[PDB]
Design a protein around this nucleic acid. Sequence first.
DNA 1: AAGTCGACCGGTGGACT
DNA 2: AAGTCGACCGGTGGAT
Lengths: 338, 338
Amino acid sequence: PFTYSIEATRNLATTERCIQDIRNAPVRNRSTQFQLAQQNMLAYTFGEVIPGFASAGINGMDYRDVIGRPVENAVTEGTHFFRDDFRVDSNAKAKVAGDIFEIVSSAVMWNCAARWNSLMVGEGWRSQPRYSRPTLSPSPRRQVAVLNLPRSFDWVSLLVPESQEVIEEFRAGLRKDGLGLPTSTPDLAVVVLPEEFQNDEMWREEIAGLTRPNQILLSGAYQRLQGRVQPGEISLAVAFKRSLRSDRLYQPLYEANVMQLLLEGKLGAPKVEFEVHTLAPEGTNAFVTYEAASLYGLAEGRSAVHRAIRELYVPPTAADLARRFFAFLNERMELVNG
Amino acid sequence: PFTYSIEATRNLATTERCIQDIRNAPVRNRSTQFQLAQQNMLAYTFGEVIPGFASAGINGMDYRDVIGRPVENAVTEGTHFFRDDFRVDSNAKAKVAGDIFEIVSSAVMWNCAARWNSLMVGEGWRSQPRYSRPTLSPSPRRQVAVLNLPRSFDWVSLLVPESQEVIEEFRAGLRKDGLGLPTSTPDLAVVVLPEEFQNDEMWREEIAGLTRPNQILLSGAYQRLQGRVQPGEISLAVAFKRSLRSDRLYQPLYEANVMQLLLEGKLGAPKVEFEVHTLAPEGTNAFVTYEAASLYGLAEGRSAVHRAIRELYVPPTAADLARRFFAFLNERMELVNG
DNA sequence: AAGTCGACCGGTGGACT
DNA sequence: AAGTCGACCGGTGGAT
Ligand SMILES: [Ca+2]
Ligand SMILES: [Ca+2]
Ligand SMILES: [Ca+2]
Ligand SMILES: [Ca+2]
């Protein structure tokens, strides 16, 4: 559970344990001895808890503590079973903690979207936990989908075919000149729900926890929307970075720039909103770095001039992340006709 | 020395050793037991050796083994003095190996600059080791300085005050709109030598090795040129990354775009040349990534659009690194009037 | 399927203050 | 100084 429990831990099938012993089944080219079972850790720690939508204690708890809990539980489990034999590289904890930060945060936003969408289709404003009711006029056309995007994703694949074609022919021409304009992906995209889906309950249901079925539901969602999103319907891009270093700031800054060049410059979309979330900015310089103007618009006679990255957000609690996303939708979705 | 020597290691004062035992003098908040003394490692391994300018075997050796030598030498010393107690985090090796790659490569380029400059002032082409003789007409005005740039550096500070003022005025306008366009730094910049310095011999002197005094000379050089470089005289920027990961590509790509926007767009400089060096690209993805057209080149839509990053270079040997740099200077310096 | 590729970030040694 | 600030990259768990 969220709070570690030996009983709960003993009740776990060997393959459900947070630590997997691979001392006898090594990974080729790797001297790894114990693996952090990331999916098992999410199921154990957050199987019945989505922070911000759980007990008032968890919702208002320091988000750093919430995010660090799965690894802590895992290390507690490994220590119990293997004592002094238990060993995991720093880089194992780094990789997993990053994924925990992203996945959990995306789940928080997923439930935000569910509650938002329910309101949009004319139901009430669910009251527990308590968040401020949006002032925006409800409409099914103002629903959104929260899409955790996979490694190796190209965000262009979200767009309707005709918009993809504009981009493809733009690049094709660049190539015959020895140039390219590859696109990677933000960690997450919030998109206006396609009309086709605007009465599917899927997008209006809050999940109770990151059980395996729910992990899969959230991580697979983007597939349902590929080739269905209009350029202006990419409402928000988010890059999660649990901590920052000066050299690890530039991927979201660059991708934001490319998204803006393509969507605003080539496809006539409004300002593309792209933000970065972190738990540990390690100084004030990352904030300055993210004050940078989007480059394309700096050329005369191009698109609107604005920041590439709208904000570097440091969520103090899960409840604050939820509050901020609701407030964002309240503003951004006003641009969408009811 | 380059080849480990038990004797030479004995001759070392303990403060000169490559492995510092801090088991009883811990770093505050750290459980580090042994430290990788990086500057000591450079003096021990390269004190009398600049690869590409040393013995034939070292010049032609796999550059990976050359750059990997200081850490290998360090581990040997550690295992000697401390046996099974000797241990270092992979993150210590990562940090040190990265610095070695950059510093050694920069030293190679420094000696290249020295030889080029000697040629430019009419002293002929130093023949040992033997590299192809540049064909470009010699001129004191075509001398260059290789500047290993420091942490927290802003490349704009290299520029003559008049050019710095142009950039500040541009940013002033941006700050009025809540925007900005900060500049960081490449690892290294090659700049045309200011006329004021074109008969100073330090710039034509090849160093014998990375003794501590020579480390300081190379690492301090940029201070001598600050506020003296013309915008069009920033001739090459280099970013060193010993290995690549997909998320670690974007700082040079982004910074190159900004350099192009400011130097080419605001200051009328010729094409800004910015390259990335690595020993381990880990696939072909990075090469594709670095084929990207300049964002502000696309923004301007002039007759010629060029890449932000000119090349991703994987040096096979220190001699190739030297050869490539000489050939680059032979072409680029043609843009400077004799 | 399971394997080959994606992308995750934290502990480090040195310069500056 | 010892404390604070930059920027280095390598080992990881899993997804058509
Ligand atoms: Ca993801
Ligand atoms: Ca991320
Ligand atoms: Ca540097
Ligand atoms: Ca570098």
